[PDB]
Amino acid sequence: SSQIRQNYSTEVEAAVNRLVNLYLRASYTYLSLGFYFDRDDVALEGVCHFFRELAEEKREGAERLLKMQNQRGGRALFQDLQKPSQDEWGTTLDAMKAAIVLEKSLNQALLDLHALGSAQADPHLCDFLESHFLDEEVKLIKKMGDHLTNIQRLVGSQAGLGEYLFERLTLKHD
Amino acid sequence: SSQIRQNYSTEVEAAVNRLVNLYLRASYTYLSLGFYFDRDDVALEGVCHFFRELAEEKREGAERLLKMQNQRGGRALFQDLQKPSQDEWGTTLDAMKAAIVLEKSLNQALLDLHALGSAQADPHLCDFLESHFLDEEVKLIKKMGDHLTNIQRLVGSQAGLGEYLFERLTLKHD
Amino acid sequence: SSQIRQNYSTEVEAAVNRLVNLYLRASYTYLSLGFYFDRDDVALEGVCHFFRELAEEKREGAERLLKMQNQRGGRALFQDLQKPSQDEWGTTLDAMKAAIVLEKSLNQALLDLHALGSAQADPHLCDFLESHFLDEEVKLIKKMGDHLTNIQRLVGSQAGLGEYLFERLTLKHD
Amino acid sequence: SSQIRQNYSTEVEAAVNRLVNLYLRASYTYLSLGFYFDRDDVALEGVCHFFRELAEEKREGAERLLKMQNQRGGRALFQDLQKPSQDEWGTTLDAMKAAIVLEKSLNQALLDLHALGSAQADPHLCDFLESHFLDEEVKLIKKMGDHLTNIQRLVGSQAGLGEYLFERLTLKHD
Amino acid sequence: SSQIRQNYSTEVEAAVNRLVNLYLRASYTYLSLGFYFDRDDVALEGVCHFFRELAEEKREGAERLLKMQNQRGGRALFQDLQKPSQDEWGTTLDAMKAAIVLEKSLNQALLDLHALGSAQADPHLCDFLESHFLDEEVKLIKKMGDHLTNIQRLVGSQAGLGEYLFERLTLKHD
Amino acid sequence: SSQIRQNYSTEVEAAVNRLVNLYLRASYTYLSLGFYFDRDDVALEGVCHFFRELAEEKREGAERLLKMQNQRGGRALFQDLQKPSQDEWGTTLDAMKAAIVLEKSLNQALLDLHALGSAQADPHLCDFLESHFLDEEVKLIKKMGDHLTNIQRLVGSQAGLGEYLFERLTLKHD
Ligand SMILES: C=CC1=C(C)c2cc3[nH]c(cc4nc(cc5[nH]c(cc1n2)c(C)c5C=C)C(C)=C4CCC(=O)O)c(CCC(=O)O)c3C
């Protein structure tokens, strides 16, 4: 019995350790996506950059859960990281559609972990979770939605030009 | 046939893609190691820091291979990342002994990829590899060896004090 | 027998003097290309600029081989410079397609000279060559490939607009 | 019929395109001369420098004619560049004697093109030519003459010492 | 078996330890040469300075081999340093002729050690060697050759004046 | 008879030339010592640094005797430099014990040369010697003695820890 731990349920840490593997594996899809747009036959650098910073952000979410878990008297247990679920990612459109989903998946996770953190009454969890995680997750998921409208409204006329303009003026304007 | 690729063998990229998975999985052991020393019952922060920067360095080596591979006309293929090969890591001594090895393993890899890069005559590979990889690898592997002498010469008297002094004055002196 | 020369084969310099004429004549195509886009009936200034700096870069590669050759005890022998192999260069697309090739041609040259520099064992050559030449050549040949994807994805819808946007936002964004 | 061209005779551009090839080929002799004094058995660096900047100046004259020609509605046509007319260049004296001549040759050209530009009444030509070209050409041809007096007055006593002093104190005094 | 060493052949270090003694003994000739021109009956300070900095440069090459050798798991073994092979060094001409040779001798050494470093397949050696050693060695050996042309072209008229001018204006002009 | 020399005995210079070889060979032991503590199985960097600066200091003493000797009308004659008298140097304790001695040996030399410089009446010698040499020699020999007390008082309990603390806090405190 680690002289620190208090109010930390064993399921609350089992959930934190799956969260850790979720962030690490979403971080994996993001670099998988990134180098796919650096490819010389896709050549869409604005997009690589979008995804390479996302990958970082996710590794950050991971490191932060690891740190809070050690701070509560948890035992960070690691599992292996499932490889990305597709290799060629298509259009920006399609890449972006895979993305907004990986993000409903992780927000959903936060949502379920936050709940177990309350029905199994857990005060500073039902705050550590929302302040960094729940919140950024909503901002990120709106801005991902706005991107889709935009690339859809563009890439639906003559599509190749839509992709270009979008990466040239969206990641170089706002 | 990607209009870019020239002098890049298919085995040279298969090797680069295993190198990518080697760097990613060594990056995995390093964060596994790091959070283990942030544990409140190990409490050796100097060591967490050592390993958390190493983990980064390795993710860097990875990103750099991914980037050169896309630059040669390669197809970065990803595999899943094997989980760390141990969970509790012991003493700094033992953690450090696991480390100098993960590093002979990756240097050995560089060594074999560099060789296939020449017996299958490959000019800017038999330079991209040494300038970042081969070289840092030697500096890193000496400094890891010097650490062992030091922690061995300390942690062999009354061991607990050796661990402390070493993390307090080595990661806070040189 | 020039009191300097050491380990420098006569074929290694014959190759360096063809390399010199290759760089000088690729430098020639680049200015030929450049003034063609300054033409008032092509009017695509972003492109002239692309090619006028390339022409310089190549004259640089040339001067540098001349200098290393005098540094090894070689006798720089000059030949005349073959005029560009086409006069009107078309579309940016077509101009760009002529380009990525002049560049596989010179990289191939570096590749063959580097090899003769080793099968005829030649240590500081099998380094002078890669550090400036082999390496820049790969970076240049990727970025030329990325350009093609981009102008192809644009100039394939209504083509005239593709050309315009590409020169306006690519050479004025990244 | 290019919607720009006005008062530009076809012979005025044929002359401008030979002028272009004259500047390019004089630029060729100058680098041929330059690397000859970087040779370790001539070793006269002050002189290499003299000629390497001259070579640039000439490439400049060339680029400028190309640019004015595109500005008048001309079609810049390129020809190949005749290799330098000698390989070993001797003494500074002799190198310098080859030089003052390549310069009467190009000034003579300016002189004949300027004339056709008037007997075939051509107003902004019979100014573009003198402002950059005719004028610099006189200053350059005096200073080349002054150099000859000087190296002749020196290199006529015990000659080797004359060469040395001249390159040491002339290109390092005025 | 030193826990560090990897891919380092025993002959590769035996060669590195002779290299160490070569650099140390060339460093010895250079100070032997230096104080000979500080002599009040030679009095040629520009030359002492030339050689005293060369001596340093060589001690540097030595220290650097010692450091890389300890970095590979080698055992730096020292031998005694053979005294300079002449005591009075003559003219600058003669001093300089002894020099360009001590330098073909060490470049030749680099050349042979680099080769054993490859026929006995050794990746980060066949780079540590060229980046500092092989390369500087060529630049140094050209500039030494240029000096000879110069002092020969001077010291061949009335010789005493040639020596003076050369040390006064070469080591005080470029 | 060198027109400079005055009051300089031939034995005074024979002594200065042995002094030169003493400084050069003590400079040799110091680098021999230095790289021994850079070894990855000794790993005591504070000590390498101690000895590498000592080695320099000694080369300085040497260069200074060479310079005064040329200043008096002496003929600096060189001899070869005897290799260090031991290869593995042990403990800091033992390394340090070899050191304080190489220093009584050179101070003793200064002492005997200073004496011959007076019984063979020699005014500016019986000052050049004490101002740089005799004096620094006493300061150096006290501080070497203080080090011994300290490492002895430490390395006599559990010895490995004594070595560590001493190099960590002595070369990083005062
Ligand atoms: C293969 C799946 C993974 C992906 C795609 C991934 C992606 C990243 N990991 C990063 C940083 C990092 N990743 C890190 C440990 C790991 N990262 C790992 C796996 C992944 N990490 C593994 C395995 C690790 C252990 C679990 C660490 C420690 C950092 C650096 C943190 C720091 O200190 O800056 C960055 C930041 C790059 C930059 O320069 O902006 C990315 C994009």
Ligand SMILES: C=CC1=C(C)c2cc3[nH]c(cc4nc(cc5[nH]c(cc1n2)c(C)c5C=C)C(C)=C4CCC(=O)O)c(CCC(=O)O)c3C
């Ligand atoms: C072989 C005959 C040639 C010689 C000797 C020559 C010499 C030169 N060309 C230069 C620059 C240049 N030369 C250039 C295009 C060419 N240059 C070429 C042929 C020659 N160019 C060819 C062939 C080209 C096309 C006609 C360009 C574009 C520049 C650079 C202009 C700029 O943008 O700075 C420079 C400037 C070097 C410096 O660093 O100061 C020299 C000396």
Ligand SMILES: C=CC1=C(C)c2cc3[nH]c(cc4nc(cc5[nH]c(cc1n2)c(C)c5C=C)C(C)=C4CCC(=O)O)c(CCC(=O)O)c3C
């Ligand atoms: C093998 C025995 C020797 C040892 C161990 C030695 C050690 C040294 N010699 C140095 C500098 C130097 N050593 C020098 C000439 C010699 N040095 C030589 C032999 C030795 N020199 C020989 C042989 C030389 C001629 C007698 C010179 C000229 C310098 C540099 C002086 C300057 O101009 O800075 C330095 C300074 C290193 C630094 O970066 O702080 C050390 C440690």
